[PDB]
Design a protein around this motif. Sequence first.
Motif, PDB file in Angstrom:
ATOM      1  N   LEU B   1       0.780  -1.300   0.066  1.00 40.99           N
ATOM      2  CA  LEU B   1       0.082  -0.003   0.059  1.00 40.99           C
ATOM      3  C   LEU B   1       0.911   1.131  -0.053  1.00 40.99           C
ATOM      4  CD1 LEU B   1      -3.031  -0.727   2.389  1.00 40.99           C
ATOM      5  CD2 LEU B   1      -2.859  -0.860  -0.191  1.00 40.99           C
ATOM      6  N   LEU B   5       1.037   4.066   4.701  1.00 34.58           N
ATOM      7  CA  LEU B   5       0.050   2.669   4.849  1.00 34.58           C
ATOM      8  C   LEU B   5       1.033   1.522   4.716  1.00 34.58           C
ATOM      9  CD1 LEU B   5      -3.295   3.601   2.981  1.00 34.58           C
ATOM     10  CD2 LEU B   5      -2.636   3.857   5.524  1.00 34.58           C
ATOM     11  N   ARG B  17       6.483   8.393  -4.711  1.00 39.11           N
ATOM     12  CA  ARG B  17       5.370   9.343  -5.667  1.00 39.11           C
ATOM     13  C   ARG B  17       5.677  10.610  -5.564  1.00 39.11           C
ATOM     14  NH1 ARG B  17       0.208   8.058  -2.401  1.00 39.11           N
ATOM     15  NH2 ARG B  17       1.679   8.304  -0.739  1.00 39.11           N
ATOM     16  N   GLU B 234     -11.910   5.991   9.479  1.00 44.38           N
ATOM     17  CA  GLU B 234     -11.507   5.190   8.628  1.00 44.38           C
ATOM     18  C   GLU B 234     -11.877   5.725   7.157  1.00 44.38           C
ATOM     19  OE1 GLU B 234     -11.465   1.500  10.753  1.00 44.38           O
ATOM     20  OE2 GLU B 234     -13.807   1.790  10.885  1.00 44.38           O
ATOM     21  N   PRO B 237      -8.493   7.588   4.416  1.00 45.19           N
ATOM     22  CA  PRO B 237      -7.117   7.074   4.325  1.00 45.19           C
ATOM     23  C   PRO B 237      -6.075   7.710   4.376  1.00 45.19           C
ATOM     24  CG  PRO B 237      -8.521   5.716   2.903  1.00 45.19           C
ATOM     25  CD  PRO B 237      -9.259   6.822   3.362  1.00 45.19           C
ATOM     26  N   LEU B 240      -3.870   8.845   7.449  1.00 49.52           N
ATOM     27  CA  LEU B 240      -2.811   8.130   7.736  1.00 49.52           C
ATOM     28  C   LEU B 240      -1.642   7.861   6.582  1.00 49.52           C
ATOM     29  CD1 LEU B 240      -4.641   5.169   9.406  1.00 49.52           C
ATOM     30  CD2 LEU B 240      -2.860   6.574  10.640  1.00 49.52           C
TER      31      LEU B 240
END
Lengths: 361, 354
Positions: B1, B5, B17, B234, B237, B240
């Motif tokens: 991920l 993550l 990235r 949650e 994402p 996080l």
Amino acid sequence: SNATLNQLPGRLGDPSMSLGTDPRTDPRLAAALTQLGLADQAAEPPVNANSEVADCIAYSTAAEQAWQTLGAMLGSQGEPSNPVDVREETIKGRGGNEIKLYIHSPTGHTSDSDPLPCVVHTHGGGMVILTAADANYSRWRSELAATGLVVVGVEFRNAAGALGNHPFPAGLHDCADAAKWVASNREALGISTLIMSGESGGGNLSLATTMLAKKEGWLEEIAGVYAQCPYISGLYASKPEELPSLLENDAYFWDMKTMGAMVKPYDPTGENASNPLAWPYHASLEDLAGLPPHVISVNELDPLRDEGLAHYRKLLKAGVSTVGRTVHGTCHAADCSFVDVIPDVYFATVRDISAFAYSRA
Amino acid sequence: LPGRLGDPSMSLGTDPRTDPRLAAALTQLGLADQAAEPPVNANSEVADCIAYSTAAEQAWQTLGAMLGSQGEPSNPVDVREETIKGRGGNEIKLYIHSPTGHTSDSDPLPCVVHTHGGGMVILTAADANYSRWRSELAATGLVVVGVEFRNAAGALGNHPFPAGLHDCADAAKWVASNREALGISTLIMSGESGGGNLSLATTMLAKKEGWLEEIAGVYAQCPYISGLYASKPEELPSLLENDAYFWDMKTMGAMVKPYDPTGENASNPLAWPYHASLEDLAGLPPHVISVNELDPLRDEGLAHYRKLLKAGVSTVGRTVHGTCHAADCSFVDVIPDVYFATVRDISAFAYSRA
């Protein structure tokens, strides 16, 4: 991105997911696709990457009509808000074949007007099917021209279908020769700069034309590249783990078995599977060094998304000035076609390409 | 991920990235590693969050001056100042940027009412990066009105929600009443992060106050709109995945408090647009939501993009790849193609509404 910590996106988290049920789809596009019967998972194709080349060619020739009809349904229902002139020109390719060019420009533009930026447009269809005369591509080129551009639509040779059967590098050579002709006729066309642009197979061709210009020493003629949802890996049969979108968005508009079959008419022997001029995703850094500024624009719900983003990162690693964009809520190439359903998205892309072309002048 | 993550030790400087030009600049500036844990958090007293924010303002302004003051637009721009009165009688300064030679007698230009970032808590329209941004927009053929709104902390503090929002709305209403004098043809709201919040909320407030027709569109960059940085739901994402990429979420959890010290507006869409209902959004003019890939705020912006669509608003959603939070608003010397791609996109959208 656009996901939850409780579930991977798309088919990675729910194998039954489709464009019609994915929470990421723009609801206007989902509704239009549902009406057309294209929101569910794409049907199983009759050919795949294990099919014989002749069978892939025959199927592609049959599939061309269906895709052209969809493009006509999507593109022929209107015209640009500003008036555009279209004329045809025929030039000679390096090998002696004739290449038709559709030249779109604002009405009243001549070699005596102030020069306008030029987009040399290479249409999609996996380098295998569809034509520049198709209504969606003519509409696109006219909508671009209406923003103040001269847009040259290349009618290049295809690997199959009505303009077939001409494997790699025939279409690439036609695109390159068209770009060279435009670059030699800037005063007659009344243009100030030249960029390459196209989507999917046409994004491949715009990228590859520019790499070929570098290899042939006329790169200075191309001021930039705007490649949409590029179809550049050729890896649709194997689904490598570096390209999760191939699984995540499989059968969103395109099933990857269809694309695995369509690879074969382009490269019947398979000898060019890692040739960057056929499949730009396989470029090395030296292949990309020195290229002019690029924009890579991918679609969020497109199985090709990740190969476009990987190429964006590789271009940057090679020192190319590169802008990377995701167009959210869209299936493969949707912002190139669904003008009546998501006009704000369609024209956001039209305006982005035009502004980029002006920024290179 | 991706990001943290898959690798909790990852940073902007090591994330594959990140645009390598940006990664190199951040590394040179000491901003590529993970952001440090702040001395305050969402459990701190309001006074400590205000004091911390006030202390951080000068550091962030210095970074903005460094990134934005090293050049000027390729087309000449005039800047003039105007002072108006807000609904409560306070004075609101406006920085009005326009192409040199533009007057009320020229052909009218599209207008952008710009609401700067800083979490609605710190920074000013006079900061060099925001002045540079407004002039670069003006140089494309726009009149750009920079609102000097009240802040929850810092030099322009201490004014909780809805003070800054009311200043942005009152400035937009003044612009809308002065189209001939300014020489403008249409009005869009635009800004980034806390300024993306304020542009979104100003437009929702215009619906509530019955002047929505004055706003022709909204271009909201990396919007800071959930207020949920302490709890990290949650559904988001990126909070996080890209935590401590530029911003640590404990820092933002602390900076929420000066804006809404009681928490009584935590679900108020005018304070935190992510909590809008569909009826809050019905009938709004066209929106563009432009998020940054490596931004902990990415996913609340994309969730709001989807909600806008669900409410029937014409909405374009874009990710600017390779960028940390708001990088295409500031790093003009490092990633000019990205910066100017965004400037041109906003300008072309403004023209498309005229």
